[PDB]
Amino acid sequence: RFLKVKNWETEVVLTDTLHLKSTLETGCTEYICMGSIMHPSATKDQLFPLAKEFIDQYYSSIKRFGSKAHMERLEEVNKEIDTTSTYQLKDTELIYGAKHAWRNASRCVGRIQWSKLQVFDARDCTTAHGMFNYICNHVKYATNKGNLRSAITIFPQRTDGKHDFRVWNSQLIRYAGYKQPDGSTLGDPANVQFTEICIQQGWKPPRGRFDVLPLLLQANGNDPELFQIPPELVLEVPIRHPKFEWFKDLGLKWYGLPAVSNMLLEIGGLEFSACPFSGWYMGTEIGVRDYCDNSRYNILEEVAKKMNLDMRKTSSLWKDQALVEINIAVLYSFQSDKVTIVDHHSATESFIKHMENEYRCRGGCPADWVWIVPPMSGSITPVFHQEMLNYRLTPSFEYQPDPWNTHVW
Amino acid sequence: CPRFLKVKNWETEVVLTDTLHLKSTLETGCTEYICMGSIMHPPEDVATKDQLFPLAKEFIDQYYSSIKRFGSKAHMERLEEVNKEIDTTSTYQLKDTELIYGAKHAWRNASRCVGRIQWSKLQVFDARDCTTAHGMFNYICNHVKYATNKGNLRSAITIFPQRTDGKHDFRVWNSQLIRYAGYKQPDGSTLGDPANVQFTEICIQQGWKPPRGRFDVLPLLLQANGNDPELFQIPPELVLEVPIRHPKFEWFKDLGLKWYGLPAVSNMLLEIGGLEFSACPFSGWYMGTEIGVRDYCDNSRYNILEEVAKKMNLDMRKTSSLWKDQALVEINIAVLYSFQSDKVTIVDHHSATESFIKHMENEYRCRGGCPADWVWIVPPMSGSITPVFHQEMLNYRLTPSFEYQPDPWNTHVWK
Numbered sequence: 001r002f003l004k005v006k007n008w009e010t011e012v013v014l015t016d017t018l019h020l021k022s023t024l025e026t027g028c029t030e031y032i033c034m035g036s037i038m039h040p041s042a043t044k045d046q047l048f049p050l051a052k053e054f055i056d057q058y059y060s061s062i063k064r065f066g067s068k069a070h071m072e073r074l075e076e077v078n079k080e081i082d083t084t085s086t087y088q089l090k091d092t093e094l095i096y097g098a099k100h101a102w103r104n105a106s107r108c109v110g111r112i113q114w115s116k117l118q119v120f121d122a123r124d125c126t127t128a129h130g131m132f133n134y135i136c137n138h139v140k141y142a143t144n145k146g147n148l149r150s151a152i153t154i155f156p157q158r159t160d161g162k163h164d165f166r167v168w169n170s171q172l173i174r175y176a177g178y179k180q181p182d183g184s185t186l187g188d189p190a191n192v193q194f195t196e197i198c199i200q201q202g203w204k205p206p207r208g209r210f211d212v213l214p215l216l217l218q219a220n221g222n223d224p225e226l227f228q229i230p231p232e233l234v235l236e237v238p239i240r241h242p243k244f245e246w247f248k249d250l251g252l253k254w255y256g257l258p259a260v261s262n263m264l265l266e267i268g269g270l271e272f273s274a275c276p277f278s279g280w281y282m283g284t285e286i287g288v289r290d291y292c293d294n295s296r297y298n299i300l301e302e303v304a305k306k307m308n309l310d311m312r313k314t315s316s317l318w319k320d321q322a323l324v325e326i327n328i329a330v331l332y333s334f335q336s337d338k339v340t341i342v343d344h345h346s347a348t349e350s351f352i353k354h355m356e357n358e359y360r361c362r363g364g365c366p367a368d369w370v371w372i373v374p375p376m377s378g379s380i381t382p383v384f385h386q387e388m389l390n391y392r393l394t395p396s397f398e399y400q401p402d403p404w405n406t407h408v409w
Numbered sequence: 410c411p412r413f414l415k416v417k418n419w420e421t422e423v424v425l426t427d428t429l430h431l432k433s434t435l436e437t438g439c440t441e442y443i444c445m446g447s448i449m450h451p452p453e454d455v456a457t458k459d460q461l462f463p464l465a466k467e468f469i470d471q472y473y474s475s476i477k478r479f480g481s482k483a484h485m486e487r488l489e490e491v492n493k494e495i496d497t498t499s500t501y502q503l504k505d506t507e508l509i510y511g512a513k514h515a516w517r518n519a520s521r522c523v524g525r526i527q528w529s530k531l532q533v534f535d536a537r538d539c540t541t542a543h544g545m546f547n548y549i550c551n552h553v554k555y556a557t558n559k560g561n562l563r564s565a566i567t568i569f570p571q572r573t574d575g576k577h578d579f580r581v582w583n584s585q586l587i588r589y590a591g592y593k594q595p596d597g598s599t600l601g602d603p604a605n606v607q608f609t610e611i612c613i614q615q616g617w618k619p620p621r622g623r624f625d626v627l628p629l630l631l632q633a634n635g636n637d638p639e640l641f642q643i644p645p646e647l648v649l650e651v652p653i654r655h656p657k658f659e660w661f662k663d664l665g666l667k668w669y670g671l672p673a674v675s676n677m678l679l680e681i682g683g684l685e686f687s688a689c690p691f692s693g694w695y696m697g698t699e700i701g702v703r704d705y706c707d708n709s710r711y712n713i714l715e716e717v718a719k720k721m722n723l724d725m726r727k728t729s730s731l732w733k734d735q736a737l738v739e740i741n742i743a744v745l746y747s748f749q750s751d752k753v754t755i756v757d758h759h760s761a762t763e764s765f766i767k768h769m770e771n772e773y774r775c776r777g778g779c780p781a782d783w784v785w786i787v788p789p790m791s792g793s794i795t796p797v798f799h800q801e802m803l804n805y806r807l808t809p810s811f812e813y814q815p816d817p818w819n820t821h822v823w824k
C-alpha cells in the first residue's frame with residue numbers, strides 16, 4: 001500500500017512508498033504497538049542474500065544496476081563468502097553503507113546532514129593502541145577548533161564473535177560519576193558503573209564533578225586497555241547566562257563533541273561492533289536531559305533557588321521556568337565560544353525540510369516521533385504536528401549488549 | 410503473541426509486566442514492518458446477528474466477572490435473555506448496571522487519556538429514552554450544569570439511544586459541547602478560533618446569527634433519530650468562563666484572553682458489547698497545557714506567542730534566545746493561576762502525569778496492564794521533566810471503548 005502522513009499544522013500530506021522496502025521488524029503487531037519501548041525484540045547461507053541485497057542497492061544508487069561491474073561484484077562476493085565465511089567491503093561501499101545507516105536512523109533529527117559525513121576506514125587496526133591512535137585522529141578532525149564536522153571511524157568487522165573490536169565507553173567523551181559514602185553521587189550518575197570499571201582497571205580518579213573519563217579499548221577480543229585522551233583534543237564550554245550574572249558561579253561545563261561509541265553498524269550482513277560516530281549537539285541534549293533528568297546532574301532546584309522562585313507548589317511551573325533559563329545559557333555559551341550547536345527550533349525546522357526532501361526523492365523517510373520531538377516545548381516545534389511512519393531500513397545502526405556482560409578476561 | 414510483555418521506567422528502573430494485552434480486541438494500525446504510533450487516525454450499515462452474538466457474550470462475561478458472579482445463575486440467564494433478544498429483534502438493550510459499567514470501562518480503556526486515575530468516579534446519565542432534539546438539548550443542559558457544579562467540576566457522560574439501522578443516528582454535531590466560533594474574513598485573516606471555522610459556517614447556514622467576536626460560544630447543533638439537526642443556544646449562565654490574568658505581569662489582563670471551564674467531547678462513539686452509541690458527550694476537567702500550550706499557542710489556533718513575547722520585551726529575532734519557550738511558560742503560569750483563583754478545577758501537567766504513573770502502576774498490579782499512548786500522554790511542553798516521558802508504555806485497544814466517527818455533515822442525508 002501507499003501510505004499517507006499528514007502535518008496537522010500545515011495540512012501538508014506526503015505519500016510514503018519507501019516502507020515497502022523494509023525487511024527488519026519494528027516490534028509492533030496489529031494488536032500491540034511498542035512505539036515507546038526503547039529496545040524492542042551469521043553464516044554463509046544467512047550472509048549471501050544480505051550481501052546481494054546491499055550490493056544491489058549500491059549499484060542501483062549509482063545508476064549501474066545490472067552492469068558488468070555489478071555482476072562481477074556479485075560473483076566476487078559469493079566466492080569469497082563461500083571460501084572465507086565472510087567478505088570485505090570495497091572502500092566506496094563502506095562509505096555508502098555508513099552514510100546510509102545514518103540516513104536510515106529513524107531516531108535522529110540531525111539527518112539533513114547525512115551525506116556530509118567523513119568516513120575513516122580503520123579496518124587495518126589490530127591493537128588497542130591502534131584504536132587509540134585512530135580515535136584520537138577522529139576526535140581531532142571532528143572537533144576542528146569548534147567548527148565541528150561529522151565523522152565516523154570504522155574498525156574491523158566481527159568474525160567469529162570471540163575477537164570483537166569494542167569501544168567500551170558509551171561515548172568517546174563523558175564525565176565520570178562517583179558513588180559517595182554520603183549516598184549521593186558526584187559527577188554524572190549515568191556513568192557510575194563505567195567509572196568504577198575504569199578505577200578497577202587502574203584509572204586514578206580526580207573525584208571531581210567534570211572529570212573526563214579515559215578510553216577503554218578492546219581490540220580483537222582481548223582484554224580492554226586504558227588510554228587518556230590528550231586534553232588539548234578535548235574541547236569544553238563553561239556554561240554562562242547572558243542576563244543572570246550569577247549563573248557562572250554554578251560551575252557548570254560540558255564538552256563540545258557528542259560521539260556515540262557503543263553502537264553496531266550493520267552493512268550487507270557484516271557487523272561493525274566498533275564504529276564511533278560524532279556530529280554536534282542539539283542544545284536540549286545538554287540543557288534538558290544531561291542537566292535536569294532526576295537521574296543525571298539534576299540541577300533544576302539549585303537554579304530555581306538562585307532565580308528566587310516560589311517552589312512550594314508544582315502549579316507555579318517553577319521547574320519549567322528554570323528549565324528554559326538553563327537551555328538559554330547552554331546555547332549562549334556554545335555560540336559565544338564559537339562551538340557548533342543547534343537549538344531545537346532550528347533543528348526540527350531542518351528536519352521537516354529533510355523529510356520533504358526524502359519523500360520527494362526517495363519516496364519516504366523513516367522517523368521515530370517519540371525520539372524526534374524535543375524533550376521541551378514539544379508542540380511549539382513543527383515536528384510535534386508531523387505524522388511520521390517508523391520502519392527499519394538497512395544499512396543501519398543497532399544496539400548491542402554492553403561489553404562487560406559478554407567478555408571474560 | 411508472548412504471554413508476558415515488560416515495560417521499563419528509565420528514570421526509576423522500575424519494571425512492570427503486562428498480561429492484559431492478550432485481551433486486545435482490534436487493530437492498532439501497526440504491523441511488524443511498520444509502526445503507526447504517531448498517526449492521529451490510523452458505509453452506513455450495522456452489525457449483523459452473527460457478528461453481534463460473540464461481541465455481546467464477551468461483554469456480559471466480562472461484566473459478571475467484574476461483579477464476582479461469573480458462571481452464576483444470573484450470568485447464564487442474562488446470556489440467554491440477550492441471545493433471545495438478538496435473535497428476535499436483531500439487537501439488544503443493556504441493563505442500567507451494564508451501561509454504567511461499560512461507560513466507566515471505555516474511559517478506563519482510553520489509551521490517550523492521562524486523567525484515567527479518576528475513571529471509576531463518573532456520573533452516568535441514561536438518556537436512552539430521548540426522542541427529539543429539544544430533548545437532547547434538555548439532557549445536555551442538565552449535564553453541563555451538573556458537571557460544572559459552580560467550578561467544582563465533576564466528570565460525567567450522557568448517553569443517547571444506540572444506533573439501530575444507521576439511518577436513525579443520534580448525533581451531537583459539535584465536536585465539543587462548549588467551543589468558540591471562528592470566522593474567515595475576506596482578507597484571509599481569521600477571527601475567533603481558526604479550528605472551528607468550518608463548523609461555525611455550518612451553524613451560520615443553519616440560521617445562527619453570529620456576534621462575530623473573539624470568544625463567542627457556539628450553539629448546539631443536535632440531531633435526533635436521524636432527522637435534520639437543530640440549533641439551540643446554551644443558556645449563558647450555564648457556561649462558566651475564566652479570564653486569564655498573570656500573578657506578576659499586570660499587563661497580561663490587557664490581552665483580553667479567557668477560556669471556558671468545562672472540556673466536554675461530543676463527537677466520539679461509545680462501543681459497548683457491540684452496541685454503538687453515536688451520541689455520548691462526556692466531560693471532565695482541564696489540564697492547563699491543553700489551553701496554555703495548544704489552544705493559545707498553536708500556530709493554527711489563537712497563536713499568541715508573538716504578542717506575549719512583545720509585551721515581555723524579549724529579543725525575538727534569533728530563535729536560540731528561546732523567546733518562544735520563555736513566553737510559553739508564562740502563558741501557562743497565567744492559565745493555572747486564573748483557574749485556581751476563580752476556584753475552577755484544573756490540574757497542572759506535573760501533578761497529572763505523576764498521578765497517571767501511580768494509576769498505571771496500580772492498573773498493572775490489579776488488572777495486569779494499562780494501555781497507554783505515549784505520544785498523547787506526554788504533555789506538549791516540558792516533556793522530559795514529567796515522569797511519563799521516561800515511562801515505556803504498551804498501546805493496545807480494549808473494549809468497551811471510545812472511537813472516532815465520521816463528521817455528521819459528511820454523511821447526513823438531508824430530509
Ligand code: HEM
Nearest residue numbers: 102105107108109110113150152277278279280281282397
Ligand atoms: C550532525 C549533527 C547531529 C545532530 C544535531 C544529531 C541529533 C540527534 C539527537 C538529538 C538524537 C537523540 C539522541 C538522544 O536523545 O540520546 C540523535 C539520535 C541518533 N543519531 Fe543523530 N545527530 C547528529 C549527527 C549524527 C551522526 C553523524 C550520526 C551517525 C553517523 C547520527 C546517528 C544517530 C543515531 C543512530 C541515533 C539513534 C540513537 C539511538 O537509537 O540510541 N547522528 N541524533
Ligand code: HEM
Nearest residue numbers: 516519521522523524527564565691692693694695696811
Ligand atoms: C477528569 C479529568 C480528565 C482529565 C485531566 C483528562 C485529560 C485528558 C487529556 C489532557 C487528554 C488529551 C486531550 C487532547 O490533547 O486533545 C485526554 C484525552 C482523552 N480523554 Fe481524558 N481527561 C479527563 C476526563 C475524561 C473522561 C471523563 C473521559 C471519558 C469518559 C475521558 C476520555 C478521554 C478520551 C477518549 C481521550 C482521547 C482523545 C482523542 O483520541 O481524541 N477523559 N484526556
Ligand SMILES: CNCCCc1cccc(CCc2cc(C)cc(N)n2)c1
Nearest residue numbers: 258259260262277278279280281282285
Ligand atoms: C542505549 N543507547 C545507547 C546509545 C545512546 C545514544 C545514541 C545516539 C545518540 C545519542 C545522543 C548523543 C548524540 C550523538 C550524535 C552523533 C549527535 C548528537 N547531537 N547527539 C545517544
Ligand SMILES: CNCCCc1cccc(CCc2cc(C)cc(N)n2)c1
Nearest residue numbers: 584672673674676691692693694695696
Ligand atoms: C477529532 N476530535 C475527536 C475528539 C477530540 C478530543 C477528544 C478527547 C479530549 C479532547 C480534549 C478535551 C478534553 C476532554 C476531557 C473529557 C478532558 C480533558 N482534560 N480534555 C479532545
Ligand SMILES: C[C@H](O)[C@H](O)[C@H]1CNc2nc(N)[nH]c(=O)c2N1
Nearest residue numbers: 036037038370371798799800801
Ligand atoms: C520511554 C521512552 O521510550 C524513553 O523515555 C525515550 C522517550 N524519547 C526519547 N527521545 C530522545 N531524543 N531521547 C531519549 O532518550 C528518549 N527517551
Ligand SMILES: C[C@H](O)[C@H](O)[C@H]1CNc2nc(N)[nH]c(=O)c2N1
Nearest residue numbers: 384385386387447448449784785
Ligand atoms: C502527529 C502527532 O501524532 C499529533 O501532532 C499529536 C501528537 N500528540 C498529541 N497529544 C495530545 N495530547 N493531543 C494531540 O492533539 C496530539 N497531537
Ligand SMILES: [Zn+2]
Nearest residue numbers: 028033439444
Ligand atoms: Zn507501533
